[PDB]
RNA sequence: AAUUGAAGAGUUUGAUCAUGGCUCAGAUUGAACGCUGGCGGCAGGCCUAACACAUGCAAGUCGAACGGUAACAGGAAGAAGCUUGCUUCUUUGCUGACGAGUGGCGGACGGGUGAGUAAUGUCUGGGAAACUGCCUGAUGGAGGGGGAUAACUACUGGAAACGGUAGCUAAUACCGCAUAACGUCGCAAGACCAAAGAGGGGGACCUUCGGGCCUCUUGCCAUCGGAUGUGCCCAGAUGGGAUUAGCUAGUAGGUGGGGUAACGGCUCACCUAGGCGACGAUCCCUAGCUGGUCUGAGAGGAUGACCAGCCACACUGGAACUGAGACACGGUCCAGACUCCUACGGGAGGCAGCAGUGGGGAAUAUUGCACAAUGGGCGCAAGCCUGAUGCAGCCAUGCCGCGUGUAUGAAGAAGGCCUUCGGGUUGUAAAGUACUUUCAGCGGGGAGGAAGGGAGUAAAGUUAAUACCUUUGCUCAUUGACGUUACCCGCAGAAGAAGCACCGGCUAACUCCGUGCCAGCAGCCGCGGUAAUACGGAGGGUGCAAGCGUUAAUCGGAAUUACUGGGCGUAAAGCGCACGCAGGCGGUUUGUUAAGUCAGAUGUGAAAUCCCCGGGCUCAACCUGGGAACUGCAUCUGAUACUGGCAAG
């Protein structure tokens, strides 16, 4: 709106699309782990947890998920992957 | 011709097709004064130190009357 | 020392959630008569310890539910 | 802000000379003191308790030449200040520069004193002070400006002034035309039949 | 960041500052953490004029406060080094 | 509301725009306001000389 | 030294006392209106329509992040008209600098408004499960690679808004890989996570002669601190209504999953069947809260403009995205009401930011000057931006100052007015005569707000360096919007400057004339039907004074909602009579408790305001240092008469 710092709008859009896509896959990975728990496969759970740990941590670093969230996932995923598996 | 003073503000000259703005208006010119409070048609605007009444044209005097009610 | 609070139990059946009433006198702001003031609080007691009528000592704490920010420390007297 | 009008009129109303025409001779009469403050002036309207109460302050006001608001504000201050609210109203009044300069004889009349103060013809401790109402402190020194020193007015003023009851709380000159405010006068060392409790009784209700 | 600065508190044409510690974001005459001195650019060569609880400035400066170029000149002049 | 028109004489007719004051007339129960002479379409009292500030009469040419 | 101060009057009656309402004296105001109006200082100024808005301004900034050249300027990988070291043309981004673009930071501050919110807030006192840009302390890291894309170029659609295809490119934009603890998960064993470069200068050695290299200054990543900010929780207080009595399904609790920065029905599945309310839930009405403001002797009553703190809102309803921070005042999306632009296909906008218009109204201002100062954003800096701010303009809206002259002047002029025709009054008032010249006018002169930055230079400050950088002296040019500043000095002459209400009692101030229950007055009683101090004019007086009245409004007097501080036989007022749940209250002794109650201590009760004492503007208003005050709240420790709880009598 006539204030040329409306470049902020086009800027933070590129942001939303970037964030969206990264934030998307780190979710679909966390899912893979919960699926394994539901499938019951102790191996694929601890396997899929190993695959997701770097993602959750990296994104938290890059500042898309933030720290304590990263913790909370691998935290209670762990709790469960070795609660019957 | 009203014994009150007015303070000039914005001034406009209708300028072929644009209400152009002015800060000064000299003698021999015409323009419209925005915002003047109580100045009717025929009044003289003179220098407060050098007061004068001018001629004032004449007021044609109506020839027709009709009564009106507000529907 | 621990900012605690004495007061008697009213209502019992809730499954680790005992409601405590806390009477208190106070002088009327305009007229001076000292008047009663009940103050009800939803209190957490792990493993349904108290029961209706009990006098209990409690302390403020981290939120535990919609209106529930107190747990007990002691009981004191019970029967009715 | 000034009265300006006919002054004996003010005096005859109060039934006593207020030295508003002090200038020279007469010291009353050549006015017909009392006997007609108006057309019905030569009457004794037996006036109420509100009456005397008003007239007595209406005197003080007229003595020092002070109009209502300033006067009221003086009343407020006298109250507030520690002390007998009655006398320190007069204190404030007497401490006035325009009064002080008169008590010192630089003008025949408190009015003439004012005109001097206003025309930048007077300095306190070296520094020129223009405003008629300047509350002067002890040890201060009002002095006439050399720029207009012992000319017509002030000569005569000192002259009949000297021939006036000569104050106590101030030391004046005449050669250097300088005076020292020694201290605030006590309720004792100024008076006539001028009450206060009336001027106070009045502003309490 | 928190800053020590001047909040104009005089009156028209006769300003009277009030040096103060504050969150830089607040208004000049606004919200402030603590008062820590003053500065009267009139004053007159009388007895008083400028005052800085230098010990407190120093303390806040210890926790990373910052200082106006003008508070600076007012410290670097009330001295504290010789 | 019904309103009083003080002073000797007035213009004031069916379409006059006036300024109403407040202040009763204890001879006219129900009349609880005055119409302010000299305001808006009400003229001041012709030829009056005393208390002109009430009754909207201007000083007569010193 | 510092919350040390309490006033009554008129009116019911033939008269009286009581009762009781109406009325008045005061203070106050964001006021308005009528008549009137000289200046200055300080302050205030849409209270109504959170009605609708034309126009301009109110948020940018970094070339020391990057590719870069559109314009400027310089230099020229060098050229005319000849005006041969002085010009104006073409090149070359070379350097200064800079439109557009990427990027970074800011746009969540600053400012406006009170719609919503009666408790999702505010206030006071506590609390635990939290994040926190820039600023700061400490410790190390800062290696090595990859893919892109704006700009640009070429086609190309629009009236405009806007773009569309294809291809090309840089970085501190983007993603892997490495590195990996005092970080995260985990009992551990172990797994796993990041990053960025850029400038100034420079001896050698040197190279594709770009710079490697050396140095200083910045920036980048990680962890733990500090600081500030923010989120969350509890108790108590913070309007009126019973002609609102019942309310409640994620409802109240639990368990386990999910979720957030974090605790939590926050969410979801199941189990329990709870939860709230006569100490007022629920539902109605009204409303931003506070510091404080006004009044009052106080307790109270009234109030929340201006200043400062908190909250909420941003055309209306709704939603999220970016981000440390928003569910965003001059951002995005949807929808609605509305307005505007169009070449009819299509577009755009939201002043409760400043100024301003219309409208509404009894009523509330300039489409101003400037970043000189204080402060805020970006920047190494210079600087750019700043309708915050500093000033000015408008309005007697308030407060406080000052003026509109000072003396002199009598058989007391004229004129007016009353007169018992003697005179009295207006009135020393006027004139006349001496004198002064503030403030306005004119001419001079001239503080303070200006501290800094900038050049030079000298300093074991660095460093390979006599560079660069930094600091500090000194030196030299310089920086006000207000501004014809404040203030001073000269000039002429009383010269330019007084209204408004009242005069029957309350109430300070009295007569003539006109009028004749007429015209009219009137806050209350009441005046007027031929001698009206009450109407209207005059003379005179009284009170105020650049204001004065009227209206409107809050408190006071009003002890007339009576806690302080009242009543009910006849004045208003005891239910027609009892029984009785809840409530209030409770004989007498001891023990015990320590809730009430009392004592102390320690925290906090923002600053401003009120008060005290000082200081500064010529005084005052105003500004200001320090203090007292904030009578409250909480906590800890004691006391145990009285009150309450418990025991036993
Ligand atoms: Mg005045
Ligand atoms: Mg650029
Ligand atoms: Mg890695
Ligand atoms: Mg759970
Ligand atoms: Mg869980
Ligand atoms: Mg509202
Ligand atoms: Mg009361
Ligand atoms: Mg909206
Ligand atoms: Mg984000
Ligand atoms: Mg807007
Ligand atoms: Mg209108
Ligand atoms: Mg009388
Ligand atoms: Mg007659
Ligand atoms: Mg009359
Ligand atoms: Mg009362
Ligand atoms: Mg009674
Ligand atoms: Mg009765
Ligand atoms: Mg009975
Ligand atoms: Mg305070
Ligand atoms: Mg006992």
GROMACS .gro file of N, CA and C (backbone and C1' of nucleotides) in nm, chain G residues 397-430:
model
  238
  982U        P    1  -1.254   3.251   2.493
  982U      O5'    2  -1.261   3.186   2.637
  982U      C5'    3  -1.352   3.082   2.666
  982U      C4'    4  -1.286   2.978   2.751
  982U      C3'    5  -1.201   3.032   2.864
  982U      O3'    6  -1.278   3.068   2.977
  982U      C1'    7  -1.083   2.864   2.750
  983G        P    8  -1.229   3.186   3.074
  983G      O5'    9  -1.119   3.117   3.167
  983G      C5'   10  -1.155   3.010   3.254
  983G      C4'   11  -1.034   2.938   3.310
  983G      C3'   12  -0.938   3.021   3.394
  983G      O3'   13  -0.983   3.039   3.528
  983G      C1'   14  -0.816   2.892   3.240
  984C        P   15  -0.945   3.173   3.609
  984C      O5'   16  -0.790   3.153   3.639
  984C      C5'   17  -0.744   3.045   3.719
  984C      C4'   18  -0.593   3.035   3.718
  984C      C3'   19  -0.516   3.161   3.754
  984C      O3'   20  -0.513   3.184   3.894
  984C      C1'   21  -0.419   3.060   3.563
  985C        P   22  -0.519   3.332   3.954
  985C      O5'   23  -0.375   3.389   3.919
  985C      C5'   24  -0.256   3.321   3.959
  985C      C4'   25  -0.133   3.391   3.906
  985C      C3'   26  -0.143   3.542   3.900
  985C      O3'   27  -0.127   3.605   4.025
  985C      C1'   28  -0.057   3.464   3.696
  986G        P   29  -0.129   3.765   4.030
  986G      O5'   30   0.016   3.800   3.975
  986G      C5'   31   0.046   3.933   3.941
  986G      C4'   32   0.148   3.943   3.832
  986G      C3'   33   0.143   4.076   3.762
  986G      O3'   34   0.207   4.176   3.837
  986G      C1'   35   0.144   3.907   3.601
  987C        P   36   0.117   4.294   3.897
  987C      O5'   37   0.122   4.401   3.780
  987C      C5'   38   0.246   4.427   3.717
  987C      C4'   39   0.231   4.486   3.580
  987C      C3'   40   0.126   4.592   3.562
  987C      O3'   41   0.159   4.717   3.619
  987C      C1'   42   0.114   4.445   3.382
  988G        P   43   0.041   4.819   3.656
  988G      O5'   44  -0.001   4.880   3.515
  988G      C5'   45   0.096   4.939   3.430
  988G      C4'   46   0.042   4.956   3.290
  988G      C3'   47  -0.076   5.050   3.280
  988G      O3'   48  -0.039   5.186   3.287
  988G      C1'   49  -0.120   4.857   3.152
  989U        P   50  -0.136   5.290   3.359
  989U      O5'   51  -0.253   5.306   3.254
  989U      C5'   52  -0.222   5.353   3.125
  989U      C4'   53  -0.340   5.338   3.034
  989U      C3'   54  -0.468   5.407   3.079
  989U      O3'   55  -0.474   5.545   3.046
  989U      C1'   56  -0.515   5.185   3.017
  990G        P   57  -0.571   5.645   3.127
  990G      O5'   58  -0.549   5.608   3.280
  990G      C5'   59  -0.492   5.698   3.373
  990G      C4'   60  -0.352   5.657   3.411
  990G      C3'   61  -0.293   5.725   3.534
  990G      O3'   62  -0.326   5.654   3.652
  990G      C1'   63  -0.139   5.738   3.354
  991U        P   64  -0.356   5.732   3.789
  991U      O5'   65  -0.219   5.806   3.819
  991U      C5'   66  -0.102   5.733   3.854
  991U      C4'   67   0.004   5.822   3.914
  991U      C3'   68  -0.048   5.938   3.998
  991U      O3'   69  -0.086   5.900   4.128
  991U      C1'   70   0.116   6.019   3.850
  992A        P   71  -0.163   6.007   4.221
  992A      O5'   72  -0.046   6.112   4.254
  992A      C5'   73  -0.065   6.220   4.345
  992A      C4'   74   0.026   6.337   4.316
  992A      C3'   75  -0.041   6.472   4.328
  992A      O3'   76  -0.052   6.515   4.462
  992A      C1'   77   0.080   6.466   4.128
  993U        P   78  -0.194   6.567   4.512
  993U      O5'   79  -0.205   6.715   4.452
  993U      C5'   80  -0.097   6.808   4.459
  993U      C4'   81  -0.109   6.916   4.353
  993U      C3'   82  -0.244   6.986   4.344
  993U      O3'   83  -0.262   7.089   4.439
  993U      C1'   84  -0.176   6.922   4.128
  994G        P   85  -0.389   7.088   4.538
  994G      O5'   86  -0.504   7.164   4.457
  994G      C5'   87  -0.479   7.286   4.390
  994G      C4'   88  -0.555   7.298   4.259
  994G      C3'   89  -0.706   7.282   4.266
  994G      O3'   90  -0.770   7.400   4.309
  994G      C1'   91  -0.621   7.157   4.083
  995A        P   92  -0.840   7.404   4.453
  995A      O5'   93  -0.906   7.548   4.457
  995A      C5'   94  -0.949   7.611   4.337
  995A      C4'   95  -1.093   7.652   4.347
  995A      C3'   96  -1.138   7.697   4.486
  995A      O3'   97  -1.245   7.791   4.471
  995A      C1'   98  -1.265   7.512   4.420
  996A        P   99  -1.215   7.941   4.425
  996A      O5'  100  -1.277   8.030   4.542
  996A      C5'  101  -1.409   8.085   4.529
  996A      C4'  102  -1.515   7.977   4.527
  996A      C3'  103  -1.659   8.027   4.516
  996A      O3'  104  -1.739   7.937   4.439
  996A      C1'  105  -1.632   7.907   4.719
  997G        P  106  -1.708   7.915   4.282
  997G      O5'  107  -1.675   7.760   4.273
  997G      C5'  108  -1.670   7.676   4.389
  997G      C4'  109  -1.674   7.533   4.343
  997G      C3'  110  -1.812   7.468   4.340
  997G      O3'  111  -1.821   7.386   4.223
  997G      C1'  112  -1.665   7.335   4.464
  998A        P  113  -1.944   7.401   4.122
  998A      O5'  114  -1.884   7.480   3.998
  998A      C5'  115  -1.878   7.622   3.995
  998A      C4'  116  -1.851   7.670   3.855
  998A      C3'  117  -1.952   7.623   3.751
  998A      O3'  118  -2.065   7.708   3.745
  998A      C1'  119  -1.733   7.578   3.674
  999A        P  120  -2.214   7.648   3.751
  999A      O5'  121  -2.245   7.603   3.601
  999A      C5'  122  -2.225   7.692   3.492
  999A      C4'  123  -2.200   7.620   3.362
  999A      C3'  124  -2.304   7.517   3.319
  999A      O3'  125  -2.414   7.577   3.256
  999A      C1'  126  -2.087   7.427   3.289
 1000G        P  127  -2.562   7.536   3.301
 1000G      O5'  128  -2.575   7.384   3.256
 1000G      C5'  129  -2.564   7.349   3.118
 1000G      C4'  130  -2.553   7.199   3.098
 1000G      C3'  131  -2.649   7.113   3.179
 1000G      O3'  132  -2.778   7.107   3.120
 1000G      C1'  133  -2.432   7.027   3.201
 1001G        P  134  -2.909   7.088   3.211
 1001G      O5'  135  -2.894   6.939   3.267
 1001G      C5'  136  -2.888   6.828   3.178
 1001G      C4'  137  -2.867   6.698   3.252
 1001G      C3'  138  -2.963   6.671   3.368
 1001G      O3'  139  -3.089   6.620   3.325
 1001G      C1'  140  -2.741   6.629   3.438
 1002C        P  141  -3.224   6.652   3.408
 1002C      O5'  142  -3.200   6.585   3.550
 1002C      C5'  143  -3.196   6.444   3.562
 1002C      C4'  144  -3.150   6.401   3.699
 1002C      C3'  145  -3.227   6.456   3.817
 1002C      O3'  146  -3.348   6.387   3.838
 1002C      C1'  147  -2.996   6.476   3.859
 1003C        P  148  -3.484   6.466   3.870
 1003C      O5'  149  -3.475   6.499   4.025
 1003C      C5'  150  -3.498   6.396   4.119
 1003C      C4'  151  -3.442   6.426   4.255
 1003C      C3'  152  -3.504   6.543   4.329
 1003C      O3'  153  -3.631   6.515   4.383
 1003C      C1'  154  -3.272   6.555   4.350
 1004U        P  155  -3.747   6.625   4.369
 1004U      O5'  156  -3.693   6.743   4.462
 1004U      C5'  157  -3.657   6.716   4.597
 1004U      C4'  158  -3.599   6.836   4.667
 1004U      C3'  159  -3.681   6.964   4.659
 1004U      O3'  160  -3.787   6.966   4.752
 1004U      C1'  161  -3.455   7.013   4.616
 1005U        P  162  -3.932   7.019   4.709
 1005U      O5'  163  -3.916   7.177   4.709
 1005U      C5'  164  -3.834   7.243   4.804
 1005U      C4'  165  -3.897   7.249   4.941
 1005U      C3'  166  -3.841   7.356   5.033
 1005U      O3'  167  -3.895   7.484   5.002
 1005U      C1'  168  -3.869   7.150   5.152
 1006C        P  169  -3.828   7.621   5.052
 1006C      O5'  170  -3.724   7.660   4.939
 1006C      C5'  171  -3.752   7.769   4.852
 1006C      C4'  172  -3.633   7.807   4.768
 1006C      C3'  173  -3.664   7.911   4.661
 1006C      O3'  174  -3.543   7.980   4.624
 1006C      C1'  175  -3.607   7.707   4.559
 1007G        P  176  -3.466   8.082   4.723
 1007G      O5'  177  -3.339   7.997   4.771
 1007G      C5'  178  -3.218   8.060   4.812
 1007G      C4'  179  -3.156   7.994   4.933
 1007G      C3'  180  -3.042   7.896   4.908
 1007G      O3'  181  -2.917   7.961   4.889
 1007G      C1'  182  -3.192   7.810   5.073
 1008G        P  183  -2.823   7.922   4.765
 1008G      O5'  184  -2.796   7.767   4.787
 1008G      C5'  185  -2.741   7.721   4.909
 1008G      C4'  186  -2.793   7.584   4.945
 1008G      C3'  187  -2.712   7.465   4.896
 1008G      O3'  188  -2.599   7.438   4.979
 1008G      C1'  189  -2.940   7.429   4.851
 1009G        P  190  -2.481   7.343   4.927
 1009G      O5'  191  -2.553   7.203   4.907
 1009G      C5'  192  -2.585   7.121   5.019
 1009G      C4'  193  -2.636   6.986   4.975
 1009G      C3'  194  -2.542   6.907   4.885
 1009G      O3'  195  -2.437   6.840   4.954
 1009G      C1'  196  -2.756   6.910   4.789
 1010U        P  197  -2.295   6.820   4.880
 1010U      O5'  198  -2.332   6.722   4.761
 1010U      C5'  199  -2.382   6.592   4.789
 1010U      C4'  200  -2.433   6.523   4.665
 1010U      C3'  201  -2.328   6.496   4.560
 1010U      O3'  202  -2.256   6.379   4.589
 1010U      C1'  203  -2.522   6.588   4.459
 1011U        P  204  -2.102   6.367   4.546
 1011U      O5'  205  -2.106   6.353   4.387
 1011U      C5'  206  -2.154   6.233   4.327
 1011U      C4'  207  -2.168   6.248   4.179
 1011U      C3'  208  -2.039   6.279   4.105
 1011U      O3'  209  -1.965   6.162   4.080
 1011U      C1'  210  -2.216   6.420   4.027
 1012G        P  211  -1.804   6.162   4.078
 1012G      O5'  212  -1.763   6.264   4.194
 1012G      C5'  213  -1.627   6.278   4.235
 1012G      C4'  214  -1.600   6.416   4.289
 1012G      C3'  215  -1.697   6.464   4.397
 1012G      O3'  216  -1.634   6.545   4.497
 1012G      C1'  217  -1.702   6.613   4.216
 1013U        P  218  -1.504   6.496   4.580
 1013U      O5'  219  -1.392   6.598   4.525
 1013U      C5'  220  -1.253   6.582   4.548
 1013U      C4'  221  -1.180   6.548   4.419
 1013U      C3'  222  -1.028   6.541   4.429
 1013U      O3'  223  -0.976   6.441   4.342
 1013U      C1'  224  -1.085   6.691   4.261
 1014A        P  225  -1.047   6.298   4.326
 1014A      O5'  226  -1.156   6.318   4.212
 1014A      C5'  227  -1.117   6.359   4.081
 1014A      C4'  228  -1.220   6.322   3.976
 1014A      C3'  229  -1.202   6.389   3.840
 1014A      O3'  230  -1.106   6.326   3.757
 1014A      C1'  231  -1.426   6.412   3.910
 1015A        P  232  -1.006   6.416   3.669
 1015A      O5'  233  -1.102   6.501   3.576
 1015A      C5'  234  -1.188   6.437   3.485
 1015A      C4'  235  -1.265   6.539   3.407
 1015A      C3'  236  -1.180   6.645   3.340
 1015A      O3'  237  -1.124   6.602   3.217
 1015A      C1'  238  -1.363   6.746   3.449
   0.00000   0.00000   0.00000
